[PDB]
Structure formats: structure tokens, C-alpha cells
Amino acid sequence: GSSGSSGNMTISDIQHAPDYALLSNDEQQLCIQLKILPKPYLVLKEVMFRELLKTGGNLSKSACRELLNIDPIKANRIYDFFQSQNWM
């Protein structure tokens, strides 16, 4: 999965990922913008759902920022993405 997880990572590191094919045309874009791998991105993605179902649909930046273990600015992008997929 992740060997080192230290030091600036290029975009090629994302496309090279062993799971960079199961990313919807839209997903791929983001991954490149937020420079996030599909492996880890998937984990957090599943969480956003497991929680969106428990509450039924009461997730907001305020919480999202906490739910996901990442930067505040980076999250924003992810949050919206979900809305773009009429998922929320």
C-alpha cells in the first residue's frame, strides 16, 4: 500500500497506484488535484458512507473535517465531490 508515506509525492505516484482504474472519470481528476492515492482515498470514501447511512444524511464540513483524518482545505474538495455525484 504505502511504503514511506514521507516526502512530496508526484502525480505519477497516483496513476501508478494498483487501484487507479476504479476511479470514475471525476474521481481521477480530484485524486490528481488533492494529490491523493486511490488506496487511501477509498478508505476515507467508505467511511463517509458508513456514516452518511447511520445518520441518514447529516454530514457537514464541521463534522467532515473531523470524520476524515486530513487537512481542512483538502477535505472541502472531497466534501463537494460527494455532492457532485448526487450522493448526498
UniProtKB/Swiss-Prot annotation:
Subcellular location: Nucleus
Cysteine-cysteine disulfides: none
Domain of life: Eukaryota
Segments forming domain SWIRM: 8-88
Coiled-coil ranges from the UniProt annotation: none
Gene ablation phenotype (knockout): Increased sensitivity to genotoxic agent generated DNA damage.
Quaternary structure note: Component of the 1.8 MDa SAGA (Spt-Ada-Gcn5 acetyltransferase) complex, which is composed of 19 subunits TRA1, SPT7, TAF5, NGG1/ADA3, SGF73, SPT20/ADA5, SPT8, TAF12, TAF6, HFI1/ADA1, UBP8, GCN5, ADA2, SPT3, SGF29, TAF10, TAF9, SGF11 and SUS1.
Note: Present with 1720 molecules/cell in log phase SD medium.
Its biological purpose: Component of the transcription coactivator SAGA complex. SAGA acts as a general cofactor required for essentially all RNA polymerase II transcription. At the promoters, SAGA is required for transcription pre-initiation complex (PIC) recruitment. It influences RNA polymerase II transcriptional activity through different activities such as TBP interaction (via core/TAF module) and promoter selectivity, interaction with transcription activators (via Tra1/SPT module), and chromatin modification through histone acetylation (via HAT module) and deubiquitination (via DUB module).
Protein name according to UniProt: SAGA complex subunit ADA2
Species name: Saccharomyces cerevisiae (strain ATCC 204508 / S288c) (Baker's yeast)
Name of the gene: ADA2
Residues of the full protein shown: 354 to 434 of 434
